[PDB]
Amino acid sequence: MADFDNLFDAAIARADETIRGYMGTSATITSGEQSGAVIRGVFDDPENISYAGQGVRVEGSSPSLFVRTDEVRQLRRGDTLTIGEENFWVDRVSPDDGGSCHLWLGRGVPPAVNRRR
Which experimental technique did the depositors report for determining this structure? NMR
| C-alpha gyration radius of the chain | 18
Separation of alpha carbons 105 and 116, rounded Å:
27
Which domains can be identified in the chain, with CATH numbers? Answer: 1-117 (2.40.10.180)
Name 76's bridge partners: none
Task: Judge contact between 90 and 78, C-beta under 8 A.
Answer: yes
CA dist 22 and 68 (Å) reads: 15
Q: DSSP H helical segments within 2-117, as ranges?
A: none
